[PDB]
Symmetry: C2
Subunit: 862 residues, 2 copies
């Protein structure tokens, strides 16, 4: 067989490697057959046959039809049926298929080899209504796809029939009605084509083949190929196969199933079977009717899992007590099911760890990191609305309408659902105290929740929040302060009442799976945390330390801390401006001690003040901003106003911030370094292992870094002397300025470690203000100008080149330079993959993204 390959249970001339000749689908059919799967017999016309076709004057090649006939004869003899015979009928299916995906190809044609005589022979065991309904559809399909007859001509008589009969929803058409349409359809063949419908099965087949070959050069198919610059190909193949039915009596039927439970992972066939074809009946009912069939099904499923090393979602049809395998694909499943299956298959000795790692997707794993309801279905009779999955996870708490109230609930150890028509940066404190957030995937609330791993249903516009009064209008029900409400941040649903939460998992399979993940990955995964509590949550999620502790975020923690910063900025005498810095030192030192204890034994990287001073000022009308500052700091109006204007900036993202501030106000960096080293020593004295790292933000030259490094080392010497003890530590820098990447060799002389700030790097490289990019990104994506939003998915070609240059040049200067990334791409699978192959030492992300990062760092290596 050089152009036509037949195939059947345990028989096939082709093999799984011939994707070129047999096309993707052909090669798979051959493989499925080659391993003993009960697949209806058939044959495949190679892509060469399609090439010789278009080349030999775009006409049917010599000898092909001969081989095709051999194939069919082989299939007929195999199935115990013949093409165009009422007694022993043989109906076929004709599908196309290239080596790769390709649109515009001839649509699948079912039940070929059918005619008035065969249709009657079919009504025999399957029924009359089914036979002629099928004959009608075939005439339509074969006519439109093979003969190029407008479907409209056919639909013109189908609806013109109801206009006389009495219905429009086809299903009422009786047997005779169908026979009448069959006649009317054939006349369409004479009216449109001039000639009659080919009643000879062989003629149909021939045409169908030619129809497929011609589909390779179709408009859609060529545009597609022309767009992706797809060349070499050679054409499409022709996959022919036998039709089968489960309506030839009670000794037949159809069913679908997952070789394993797609929700729990339990190793048990999970599906349903329909007898003679109503509503489905479970599997156990099949064997109790078709024993030899159910047994064949079982052996088929075992084969699938043994060979494909994966759970399968299939469609089978048992015809007259004989089972048939029609469709098989890797089965979708929940994360719970994904992890259990991966682990059982390893324990079963079916797959090894390195392969199991690829069986759990980031989406699967995410599901297991947040609490979930016990039965999202059991509460269908209670759902009262649906919004957007701003942040996955299940939550149950009492309704509240203010951050302050949420915080209050939290302080009493109680669960509250914060509900606000919309949120603001001032409610952030309450949003963290709430067990769930609900507002009337891109909303600013959603983003915040995700990092915390907090449930949040945003964009639920079908809601009205009554503030004056303490109630909210949602769906048809009204909820008032104190009433229970459930939120599903994964589905976006807003159930009513107190739905149950699945209890902690005891299987240990997640722990088992993750140990493989951690064994395989080379990248370390750190966490971005600014508080002792987040440090703990990061450690519990497997973080190997803290790659980024943002000191500015340690002040927006309380009104008191914020006022303290303002006092600093408004100081009149250095005698007081130092007193204000001294005040900030305790807050810092206290927070660092807490973070260090939580990270006992792990490296902790703390970044020097980065935001422009303007950020720590009240917001609102200028007059009011001035009033608040005077009351909070003791400054007069003139000075306050002058100071506010002086701190104002046109482009704050590139203004007076980062090391520029640290360099201009040395005392600031000296205060933070003192706070760090003193906290470190205090915790060491209590037996905590502390490995502090100090990082300088927004550096663009070696000089800026050197200046800050000198300051840090000086403070370290004094603190160590004053406390009579010394501990190791490291000084490093952020690489978020494109210039820094360019002169990374020079910068590496002073920095012991590099930490890419791809957020800022992406902003400066693209010249994109993330704060304002929302005004044109949608258009860029819609227009194909951008493939992905650079802020979510690392732009490997651009930003990526700078990361590579910087990494290479920095390590050439300091061979053991530690290199990481703390931008948000640090928790994004495709970005993490790029960082791994770029040779970075680690990635650092939010606490709850840590497991995802770990998974991604392993998957890229296997």
């Amino acid at each position: 067989k050089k152009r036509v390959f037949h195939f059947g249970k345990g028989k096939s001339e082709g093999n799984k490697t011939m994707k070129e000749l047999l096309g993707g689908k052909g090669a798979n059919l051959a493989e499925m057959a080659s391993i003993g799967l009960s697949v209806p017999p058939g044959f495949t016309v190679s892509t060469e046959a399609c090439q010789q076709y278009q080349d030999a004057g775009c006409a049917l090649p010599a000898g092909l039809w001969a081989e095709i006939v051999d194939g069919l004869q082989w299939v007929e003899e195999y199935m115990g049926a013949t093409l165009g015979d009422p007694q022993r009928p043989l109906l076929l299916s004709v599908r196309s298929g290239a080596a790769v995906s390709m649109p515009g190809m001839m649509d699948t044609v079912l039940n070929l080899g059918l005619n008035d005589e065969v249709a009657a022979g079919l009504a025999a065991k399957s029924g009359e209504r089914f036979a002629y309904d099928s004959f009608r559809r075939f005439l339509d399909m074969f006519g439109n796809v093979v003969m190029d007859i407008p479907r409209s001509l056919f639909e013109e008589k189908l609806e013109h029939m109801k206009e006389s009969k009495g219905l429009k929803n086809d299903t009422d058409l009786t047997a005779s009605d169908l026979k009448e349409l069959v006649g009317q359809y054939k006349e369409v063949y004479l009216s449109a084509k001039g000639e009659p419908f080919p009643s000879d099965p062989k003629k149909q087949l021939e045409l169908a083949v030619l129809a497929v070959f011609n589909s390779w050069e179709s408009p859609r198919a060529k545009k597609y190929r022309s767009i992706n610059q797809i060349t070499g190909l050679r054409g499409t193949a022709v996959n022919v196969q036998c039709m089968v039915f489960g309506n030839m009596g009670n000794t037949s039927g159809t069913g679908v199933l997952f070789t394993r439970n797609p929700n729990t992972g339990e190793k048990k066939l999970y599906g349903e079977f329909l007898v003679n074809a109503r509503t489905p009946e479970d599997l156990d009912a099949m064997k109790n009717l078709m024993p030899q069939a159910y047994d064949e099904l079982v052996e088929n499923c075992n084969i699938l899992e043994s060979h494909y090393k994966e759970m399968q979602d299939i469609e089978f049809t048992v015809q007259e007590n004989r089972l048939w395998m029609l469709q098989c694909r890797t089965g979708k499943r929940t994360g719970k099911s994904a992890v259990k299956i991966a682990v059982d298959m390893v324990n079963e000795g079916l797959v090894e760890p390195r392969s199991a790692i690829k069986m759990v997707e980031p989406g699967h794993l995410d599901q297991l990191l947040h609490p979930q309801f016990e039965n999202p279905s059991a509460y269908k009779d209670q759902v009262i609305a649906t919004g957007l999955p701003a942040s996955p996870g299940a939550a149950v708490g009492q309704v509240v309408f203010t951050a302050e109230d949420a915080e209050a609930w939290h302080s009493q150890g109680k669960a509250a659902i914060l509900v606000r028509a919309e949120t603001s940066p001032e409610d952030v404190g309450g949003m963290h105290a709430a067990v769930g957030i609900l507002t009337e995937m891109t909303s600013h609330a959603a983003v915040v929740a995700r990092g915390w791993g907090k449930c949040c249903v945003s964009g639920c516009s079908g809601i009205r929040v009554n503030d004056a009064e303490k109630l909210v209008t949602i769906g048809g029900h009204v909820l008032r302060e104190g009433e229970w409400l459930s939120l599903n941040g994964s589905t976006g649903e807003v159930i009513l009442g107190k739905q149950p939460l699945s209890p902690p998992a005891l299987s240990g399979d997640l722990g088992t799976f993750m140990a493989w993940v951690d064994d395989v990955r080379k990248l370390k995964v750190l966490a971005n945390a600014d508080t002792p509590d987040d440090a703990l949550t990061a450690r519990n999620n497997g973080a190997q330390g803290i790659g980024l502790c943002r000191t500015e975020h340690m002040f927006f923690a309380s009104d008191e801390r914020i006022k303290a910063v303002r006092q600093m900025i408004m100081a009149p005498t250095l005698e007081l401006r130092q007193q204000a810095l001294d005040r900030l030192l305790p807050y810092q030192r206290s927070d660092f001690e807490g973070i260090f204890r939580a990270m006992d034994g792990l490296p902790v990287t703390i970044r020097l003040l980065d935001p422009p001073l303007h950020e720590f000022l009240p917001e609102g009308n200028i007059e009011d901003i001035v009033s608040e500052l005077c009351a909070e700091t003791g400054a007069n109006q003139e000075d306050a106003l002058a100071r506010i204007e002086k701190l104002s900036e046109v482009n704050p993202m590139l203004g007076f911030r980062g090391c520029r501030l640290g360099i201009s106000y040395p005392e600031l960096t000296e205060m933070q370094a003192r706070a760090i080293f003193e906290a470190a020593i205090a915790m060491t004295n209590q037996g905590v292992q502390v490995f502090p790292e100090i990082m300088v933000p927004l550096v663009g030259t070696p000089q800026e870094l050197g200046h800050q490094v000198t300051l840090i080392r000086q403070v370290a010497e004094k603190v160590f002397a004053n406390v009579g003890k010394t501990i190791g530590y490291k000084v490093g820098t952020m690489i978020e300025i494109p210039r820094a990447a360019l002169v990374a060799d020079e910068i590496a002389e002073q920095a012991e470690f590099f930490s890419f700030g791809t957020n800022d790097l992406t902003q400066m490289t693209f010249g994109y203000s993330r704060d304002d990019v929302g005004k044109f990104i949608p258009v860029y994506l819609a227009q194909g100008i951008l493939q992905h939003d650079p802020f979510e998915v690392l732009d490997q070609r651009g930003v990526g080149e700078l990361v590579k240059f910087a990494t290479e040049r920095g390590r050439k200067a300091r061979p053991n330079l530690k290199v990481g990334i703390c931008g948000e791409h640090g928790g994004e699978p495709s970005s993490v993959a790029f960082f791994a192959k770029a040779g970075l030492d680690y990635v650092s992300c939010s606490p709850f993204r840590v497991p995802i990062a770990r998974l991604a760092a392993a998957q890229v290596l296997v």
Copy 2:
């Protein structure tokens, strides 16, 4: 002579090439002597002698003193005088000097070999008061620099003498008073050193030599060397020479001069001579007293110019009818003098063009591009204040206090001086109409003037501008509207009245000099102009076309045009938003026709709209902004407010601007392209040669550029068809986004030319908001973190690498890719030099910077 080289008129063992052994100064002295200059005889101790010194146990090397003695004997026999002899006295000078500049070295010591006996022998012909005053100074100097005796010990007796005598301003001290101090000074030698002042000339010399060798390892000298990582050196040399005086009678004197007039360039000795030493007398008086001397001077000057190929500023001393050449250096001169001298020296066959080009500095040339007063001195008795040279040039006009009034004066063809305590972006229209600007080098007014080439004296804080009333308080005089006032933007002066302006130059020397400049340069120099009048001013300054015409600046031209843009932004129906665009089309088309005619025969590159739409909105309180917009566009309050907020941005430099706007609102780019092509055809039909170029701003990907290019080419096809004519044109892009540089190979597929926008490129590369960088740049420069402001002087190491990468990769893709730069570095000498060697095709700057650019593009090549 292997360690000590003597030298005299036409005699010297060393030569101009021995900068290593003889040090920079030694080699020069040798060269000066080697060509027959009348330089007092002397000798130089090689740097080896200094090395052997520090190495042989930091002590005087063997044989050296022997050679030193040979040298002195040679000099004595040469001069007809002996060391330590009253009758035939010989006084020496001892200077240090390495191969390169080096601070911390032993200070120059004059009149060595002096004592009580010699001092008397000196009082003989020079006088008593001079002799002992010199002896006193020598004792002091020799004691402090050679014996390490605190000057304080000496000054303690110098002021303690006046406390008894009766004066403090040394010059009254009589001969005997000096003799008394001489005695008191020597006692300081016994009190401080223990031993007496070495009265033996030979001992002094020896010590002096050792003093110099020891100066190489001095604190200051080592820190300096340690900072610049200066190695290899080997030490400093010792230059010894004979002293000479012009106070030994009427047959002696001293004088200084320029071999050519430093103000006009006239080939005539320009200087003054002082007899026996009062107030100086001109040169002609020298010959009429010392003929053989004046004749020697003449031959010396001719030699200097013949050998050094440059005008010289010197100091000479004629002692007893014998001339001596003491100091020679290239003479400072005005730009007028620089150009005339360079051109005459070529005509004289003294230097060739390639060398003359290096004789005129950018500062020199700048002086000749703007009008100047006839005699800044003649108006000294009229100056009434002094400020900052915000923008060079002389200006004479009537005082006015509003832009509107300046514009009014201009419309009547009259000269006005705009005077405002400070200026704003709204007065820009009047500032251009004024012939001069004056406000009460970094002020925003100054910068603006420079481009226009307009006179401006900013920062003249000693001024009070009375608005209510139409007068201004300056100096002691009060000026009211209409009164004449003169401004010097070069000096910063504010003369009173109507001072005369030098008439146009007729020499033709500037034209001659510039033709050499233009012959040598390879870079073409284009101009940045947005109006027909600026295009003309650029052409008159030698611009070879327009590298950048900013279309946004073509709208801030008149209230009407600005309102038209606002109407566009506030359009309610597309039926009107197009009517608003149609309105903008005429303004554009009309301006382009004008620009094209002025640039007949030269390429004109026009850039698509670049500023964020927010920029075209009124400024002020929000409520007022809304009111104005409603009145100007017909919008209601709600919509106006919504629109204003919607256009607001956090970081406008990286927001919704440039091609992002052109891509999101295609009609905008279609309107501009139509305007361009229609203007081009209209002018071609009138016989003007038009070579239009369309440039796409702020591109970061090939896709953004392709999208805009497609739009442009479509409009070009329609316009050419509608007008039945076709002309050539080009499409290109700005390279101001770091990412664009990185993917310049891809971008080059669509762009026919690259134009670097180093302003923006520098902002994104450094992450510097130029609008806000002023808050830390001063500190960075003061702290040595930055060498230069990157926005003025191209950062070759960083921004420069991106320019190189982009240029190389872009040309590899499109070999004939035209590559230029239009950022401000395009007119900065060191930046222009970098662009030339980077292989760019051209630079484009403001109109009046064009000649400077041309000069710089030539100087880098010779």
